[PDB]
Write a protein that binds this ligand. Structure first.
Ligand code: HEC
Ligand code: HEC
Ligand code: HEC
Ligand code: HEC
Ligand code: HEC
Ligand code: HEC
Ligand code: HEC
Ligand code: HEC
Ligand code: HEC
Ligand code: HEC
Ligand code: HEC
Ligand code: HEC
Ligand code: HEC
Ligand code: HEC
Ligand SMILES: O=S([O-])[O-]
Ligand SMILES: O=S([O-])[O-]
Ligand SMILES: O=S([O-])[O-]
Ligand SMILES: O=S([O-])[O-]
Ligand SMILES: [Ca+2]
Ligand SMILES: [Ca+2]
Ligand SMILES: [Ca+2]
Ligand SMILES: [Ca+2]
Ligand SMILES: [Ca+2]
Ligand code: NA
Ligand code: NA
Ligand code: NA
Ligand code: NA
Ligand code: NA
Ligand code: NA
Lengths: 519, 259, 519
């Protein structure tokens, strides 16, 4: 059984923790629930750690007193189809392979599934580690609780004796790097300096061997990613988000200074050897928009190239860990600002961006966001009980599974079927425009080889490449973004029409140039 | 927000609690979750209580860290038909009135329903308090969470100015007495001497005015009836059961000495 | 009412039947249930048949005493969508037309449906008989019992006065030949010599007019295909299977000699005029793996061409009735061994194989097969009754319809939804790789015309054609195979990655050669 330690001993050296812990809703929660610090207390000085205390980062450290939230979190939504490739006619991006040719996502890009699996899915996807990591057997794919207990309880490593990224299966890639892990786990929260910069006190950084780092990580979406363990107050821990909101002064709601001030973030820094080491962002309110924006954003978490001169931008560069914190119509400016692109298209030769799940930046400015609605209202609603203590569901999933608690709790004028119908109207319309956008992108792409064989000039091809950047951006945002337009229907529509317009312009340019060579 | 107290100071006087608390699965649970002892600590000696500390007996004291058990407990099983008289042809004892004639159960004896309602149901049944206590309105019969929060949040007393047992409705009885309450609540666990014997330190006993006692009681089936709050270990608190098992030497399984 | 005949009279001449019948579980079943032999007994000699006895091959001959098995067999699974073309974006092979161009399956290839319909579906499919045979009207498509009673009770023939294969509808083919029928019916079991070789006593053979043969056939999947009618013991009757297992000595489990010996096959031959005529394969155990492998295998049942010199291989050749009895990674060797390919691709000119439903050869080596699981455990499970005599369900269908009897009977650790989720993980992953494999095959195929117009050398085109064979094989196995990887997930994955690798190699080769002509 646990035996409490004297927190006053700790508070002598840990004044920020004292301030947070004594004032918040965990003032009665003893340190032993999460730290084994006996040898540390015997050996530390005011400025030197001595022996490192052991800190629990498993989610069961919180389940101890918060079983309802834990159990809701670890539920597996079996209706969220697993390992479902997006580059298929029945999924989100039927022409993805042609359009993304040159990028690692061509090797595999599945739809998301339940949060329990985030770390294991990151480890096993064909694009990440060359097939090095696999489930121990095909039964383990169902085991959400097991994945939560730890990735290495359900996975195997093809070669524990080597730590290099390489291909073990032929049609895999090795895109994973240390920055990725920040959106899969925070088991490394005490071992990673802010932004992944090099730091004497950091075991891991942007430039680490990712296979070695992987082996040290266990748990998905730790509870403390949104809740400070010392104050129990709302927070974020993700460096890239704090960097956008606070360091760059963009605010929590970059389009609304008033809401940014009311629902702000305060950066708190922790030191090692009296040098800044790590940071968190305490929130003014329990604002799920900002909590979920730790991960559900467009980002760089990867090497790339400069738009200006094509030079390589490696993991050592700060730009390899970057939150753009820009809506679709501000993204090109944001990427030009940091002088960055992701890949060159394998057929067209265009420098292109790679977009990922920009839910937060899409939600901005929507009617829902402007009315003060937040992600949790639809995806983590309060549970309605005839008799009981209310709590917040932590099963982050589609509102279709809890329409009474989600949509219908605000939209009294609708039946469930009516609300579903409104969702589907938007998704169906948006998906139609995604498909048309892909049709036109593909038409343009297929003209590049014809133009090259016809002897069309490099000047014309470069004009078309510039159009490809925009055609790509204004399409891929929406295959990347998970709501199929629901989060911001008007923006999806305007963007996708812009994509089609750009592709059409490029098609006309290339066809005319080919015709003139003939011729 | 709760602020923890120095448990080690309490332990300088409370040695049994120290032994229980420090060894069990509540060793990290601070006393402030259940006791407001500020004035007590300022005034007590090992031999004199001084100011009485306030002890929480509401089930929400435990729901704080054990929501799953609390929420399962307070669920109302709507299929457990409520206020269903047993002395009817379609229930358990069709000829009960003839057979029980002379006993107060002839006035009303319903089937049991969900535990959330035990104390309110005891208070309002026609055989118990002469009809003195009633739900505030007929809607409140559904409110299990409300009953758990406290009986007096959902009930009324026909005459707060008197404390005698009497009939307010013609076909009622006044069978309730203080002993009954021991199977409805343990809100009185610090105010009732073992067995309900007279005791200088007991506010309530077998001979108390049951209407006055009733008014001091709120919560059904307190969580600590089965779980010691200090050790978190399994227990009973009911005097009559301890008396049978231990005092009278009958054992927990009278027909199996080994068990 | 039936009147029994004196079996001892028959046993005087039929000593193999005596031996089988007197010892097995049909020792009390009189010959009159299946044979009208009165005139035969009056006219036969020890070595000459005399008048031919009439043998019942309708399934109702067995339903008489085995109603439960009959009724389960004839059930129509309405959820098995009928006449559903595979070459569509929502089915198994979205790019099948491009990839299979040159082959008769381009005319129509639907998903399988319930067994009751196998013979009628063979007769009416657009690729088989030029549209000659059709349902009497569109209502008859529902009539499983009717199809079982006989094909010609529910079908019409456009021209009873001619027996040639020809097109009656414009977009049909005439691919059917006598070998096909062996996997649709065994009504011809006494009229077809082993392998379909020419034989004095055979009415039908590989070289027969298929339209004439068709008209003589009635019943699907006769009960006696798996159960000897004389001993009631387990067997196979399909010549090609016996040829692989016994004649070629490959065994019932070619990858496991021990299991092959324990679960073997004994070839029993019947003569006409004291010349070998037909054969059956008695099984040591009631092994559904081998029973179902009568049909759910990759085979030749068709003319083709030699790999060595391109010469025609006609129906007269033994190779026109052949079970390869090889896994996907052994198939190229098996086809080279018999010097055979199916068609030349209409665009690339590559000699290609045509694969069909290799379920048996895929299942080998899977975790399930290695643990002693067999087809019936998932597709013909025992029926669970609260009170009753257990029998084996003969409704061969997806285990999704009987998860308690199938998966969950072995996998106690799972709920139904969890087991379904495990299936879907595999199928979704496998289907994604099928789609990607098709993407790369199509990319390669489309380069052939460009390369030809560019003047790329025949040597380079032939190199690419050799790659096409492999790219094709390692893809088409999995669109042909019905489990979408579930039967052997690891093999599907390795094969499909090999397909993509081969196509990519060919794309690079062709693009480089085109570029060099330009450059
Ligand atoms: C002064 C003598 C200290 C005592 C008393 C305690 N800690 Fe400590 N700790 C101390 C230092 C100088 C550091 C390094 C960081 C810094 O503030 O300079 C630490 C670090 C920790 C950590 C972080 C460990 C990691 O992996 O990075 C933890 C979790 C921690 N300390 C906990 C802790 C506890 C629970 C204590 C009371 C039981 C405690 N510390 C006492 C210095 C001192
Ligand atoms: C029992 C010993 C606890 C452990 C272990 C954890 N928490 Fe806790 N938490 C506990 C209490 C008694 C309370 C106060 C309840 C109240 O409503 O007063 C809390 C509260 C929280 C909250 C709510 C915070 C708020 O400001 O409203 C959160 C978000 C929370 N706790 C989270 C949390 C996490 C993430 C834990 C693991 C790191 C964790 N708690 C452990 C008791 C206990
Ligand atoms: C936070 C800014 C992220 C970073 C950094 C990385 N990922 Fe991610 N990932 C993130 C979210 C919010 C989601 C769910 C929404 C979605 O669109 O999928 C994902 C999902 C994945 C998955 C599962 C789906 C799939 O693509 O197959 C995988 C396998 C995955 N992510 C891998 C991955 C890799 C290799 C990364 C570094 C190169 C990486 N992620 C970074 C959020 C974030
Ligand atoms: C961000 C993605 C979250 C993670 C990770 C966890 N929780 Fe959470 N929690 C989150 C939100 C948006 C809310 C509601 C805030 C509001 O005021 O509306 C909560 C709330 C809680 C609480 C408070 C009680 C309740 O409302 O249920 C607790 C005790 C809590 N969360 C616990 C908890 C645990 C144990 C987690 C890991 C299993 C966990 N949270 C993760 C957002 C996020
Ligand atoms: C000695 C100086 C004491 C200290 C320090 C604390 N308590 Fe105490 N307590 C003391 C006495 C002499 C008594 C009377 C009963 C007895 O054992 O003789 C008490 C009583 C209590 C009670 C029971 C109150 C009731 O309703 O009957 C409680 C719940 C209690 N004490 C709690 C408590 C706490 C939590 C303390 C530390 C904060 C504490 N006591 C200190 C003597 C002394
Ligand atoms: C949070 C501050 C708590 C309060 C308030 C209560 N309990 Fe508790 N309890 C808490 C913890 C951290 C644990 C240990 C969990 C573990 O498995 O290690 C417990 C445990 C219990 C148990 C199980 C005990 C055992 O098996 O020995 C019980 C029965 C229990 N708790 C009951 C309980 C009651 C009835 C409470 C109100 C009087 C109560 N707990 C409050 C944390 C917290
Ligand atoms: C524990 C030994 C008990 C004592 C003392 C009293 N009651 Fe009780 N009561 C007890 C149980 C276990 C049950 C549920 C099972 C059942 O058979 O009903 C009850 C139920 C009631 C009810 C509800 C059902 C009904 O009879 O209408 C009422 C109204 C009730 N009890 C009243 C009551 C009175 C007035 C008591 C003292 C005279 C009394 N109970 C004592 C357990 C125990
Ligand atoms: C609106 C036209 C009503 C309809 C239809 C139903 N009820 Fe009603 N009820 C209504 C009002 C305005 C009130 C008074 C509310 C208050 O607190 O002032 C009620 C009251 C009841 C009660 C309590 C009766 C009592 O205490 O004497 C009950 C048990 C009740 N209502 C139940 C109920 C049922 C089950 C209904 C459908 C059969 C129903 N009501 C319809 C208004 C309206
Ligand atoms: C010897 C005089 C025979 C008697 C008595 C019976 N049969 Fe016969 N049968 C005989 C011969 C020589 C042959 C040809 C094959 C051979 O073994 O040489 C047959 C053939 C049959 C067949 C096959 C018919 C077909 O279509 O190929 C059957 C089904 C058959 N015989 C059945 C049968 C029965 C049921 C008899 C007793 C009533 C019986 N035969 C007697 C020779 C002789
Ligand atoms: C009644 C006159 C029968 C006819 C017609 C058919 N079968 Fe039969 N069968 C019958 C009996 C009395 C038995 C024995 C039952 C037992 O369990 O002892 C059987 C058995 C079978 C078996 C089981 C064989 C085994 O070795 O376990 C099978 C597979 C079987 N029968 C199949 C079968 C077929 C395919 C029939 C039509 C050709 C057929 N039977 C007819 C009785 C009768
Ligand atoms: C056994 C080795 C077979 C031979 C010889 C032929 N077919 Fe077949 N066929 C077989 C199976 C096991 C299945 C079901 C599984 C599947 O993948 O479909 C089928 C199915 C058909 C169908 C229905 C589905 C479709 O393709 O439309 C038809 C129309 C069909 N088969 C026709 C057919 C023809 C024309 C054949 C000779 C050229 C032929 N089959 C041979 C097994 C076997
Ligand atoms: C009565 C007003 C009808 C309604 C309503 C439906 N059907 Fe019908 N159908 C009707 C007749 C008189 C016939 C001809 C029957 C005959 O054998 O002479 C039919 C035929 C069909 C067919 C066959 C079509 C063909 O072969 O070309 C089909 C497939 C059919 N009917 C299906 C069907 C469906 C599914 C209906 C609801 C959508 C339906 N029919 C309605 C009369 C009537
Ligand atoms: C191969 C594709 C089969 C065909 C055709 C038929 N049956 Fe079958 N049968 C098959 C299997 C795999 C089994 C189970 C074997 C085992 O021991 O596990 C059976 C079993 C029977 C039995 C035995 C009793 C029982 O288990 O149900 C009987 C009587 C039987 N089969 C009858 C039967 C009939 C009447 C058929 C045509 C409708 C038929 N079988 C076809 C495999 C195959
Ligand atoms: C008993 C006759 C089985 C039936 C019916 C099903 N499965 Fe099975 N399965 C069985 C065994 C003995 C094993 C190996 C267990 C071990 O850990 O040694 C399995 C394995 C699987 C697997 C893992 C496959 C792999 O890793 O390659 C899966 C995904 C699986 N089983 C699923 C499954 C499904 C969904 C079933 C119904 C369609 C099913 N099994 C039936 C035994 C038996
Ligand atoms: O209190 S923290 O800064 O060590
Ligand atoms: O790869 S992750 O960003 O979706
Ligand atoms: O007995 S059989 O060989 O005619
Ligand atoms: O054509 S049959 O083999 O599927
Ligand atoms: Ca999903
Ligand atoms: Ca990006
Ligand atoms: Ca009841
Ligand atoms: Ca089917
Ligand atoms: Ca073939
Ligand atoms: Na979904
Ligand atoms: Na609002
Ligand atoms: Na094209
Ligand atoms: Na009941
Ligand atoms: Na199907
Ligand atoms: Na086994």
């Amino acid at each position: 059984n646990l035996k409490p330690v004297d927190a006053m001993q700790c508070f002598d050296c840990h004044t920020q923790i004292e301030d947070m812990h004594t004032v918040g809703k965990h003032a009665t929660v003893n340190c032993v629930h999460c730290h084994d610090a006996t040898e540390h207390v015997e050996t530390a000085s005011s400025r030197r750690m001595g022996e490192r205390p052991v800190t629990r980062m498993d989610l069961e450290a919180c389940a101890t007193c918060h079983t309802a939230q834990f159990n809701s979190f670890v539920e597996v939504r079996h209706e969220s189809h697993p390992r479902l490739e997006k580059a298929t006619p029945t999924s989100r991006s039927p022409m993805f392979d042609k359009l993304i040719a040159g990028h690692g996502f061509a090797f595999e890009h599945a739809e998301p599934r339940s949060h329990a699996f985030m770390l294991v899915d990151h480890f096993v996807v064909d694009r990440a580690y060359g097939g090095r990591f696999q489930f121990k057997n095909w039964q383990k794919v169902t085991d959400g609780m097991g994945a939560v207990r730890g990735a290495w309880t359900v996975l195997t490593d093809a070669d524990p004796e080597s730590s290099d990224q390489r291909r073990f299966l032929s049609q895999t890639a090795t895109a994973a790097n240390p920055v990725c892990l920040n959106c899969k786990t925070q088991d490394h929260i005490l071992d990673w300096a802010y932004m992944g910069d090099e730091h004497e006190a950091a075991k891991w950084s942007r430039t680490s061997e990712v296979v070695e780092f992987a082996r040290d990580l266990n748990h998905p979406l730790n509870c403390f990613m949104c809740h400070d363990p010392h104050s129990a107050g709302p927070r974020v821990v993700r460096d890239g988000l704090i960097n956008a909101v606070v360091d760059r002064g963009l605010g929590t709601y970059p389009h609304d200074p008033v809401k940014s001030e009311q629902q702000g973030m305060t950066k708190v820094t922790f030191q090692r050897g009296r040098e800044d080491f790590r940071a968190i962002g305490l929130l003014d309110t329990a604002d799920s928009n900002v909590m979920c924006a730790q991960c559900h954003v467009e980002y760089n978490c990867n090497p790339g190239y400069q738009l200006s001169d094509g030079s390589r931008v490696g993991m050592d560069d700060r730009r390899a860990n970057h939150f753009f914190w820009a809506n679709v119509f501000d993204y090109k400016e944001a990427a030009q600002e940091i002088d960055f692109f992701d890949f060159r298209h394998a057929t067209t030769g265009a420098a292109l961006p790679k977009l990922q799940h920009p839910e937060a930046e899409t939600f901005w400015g929507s009617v829902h966001e402007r009315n003060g609605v937040a992600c949790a209202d639809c995806h983590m609603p309060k549970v309605q009980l005839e008799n009981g203590k209310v709590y917040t569901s932590h099963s982050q999933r589609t509102p279709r599974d809890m329409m009474g608690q989600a949509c219908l709790n605000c939209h009294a004028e609708w039946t469930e079927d009516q609300a579903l119908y409104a969702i589907d109207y938007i998704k169906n319309y948006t998906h139609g425009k995604i498909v048309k956008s892909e049709y036109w992108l593909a038409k343009m792409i297929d003209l590049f080889p014809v133009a090259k064989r016809a002897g069309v000039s490099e000047d014309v091809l470069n004009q078309a490449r510039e159009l490809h950047y925009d055609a790509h951006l204004y399409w891929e945002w929406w295959t990347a973004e998970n709501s199929v337009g629901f989060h911001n229907p008007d923006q999806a529509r305007e963007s996708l029409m812009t994509s089609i317009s750009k592709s059409k312009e490029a098609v006309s340019l290339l066809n005319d140039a080919i015709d003139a060579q003939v011729a």
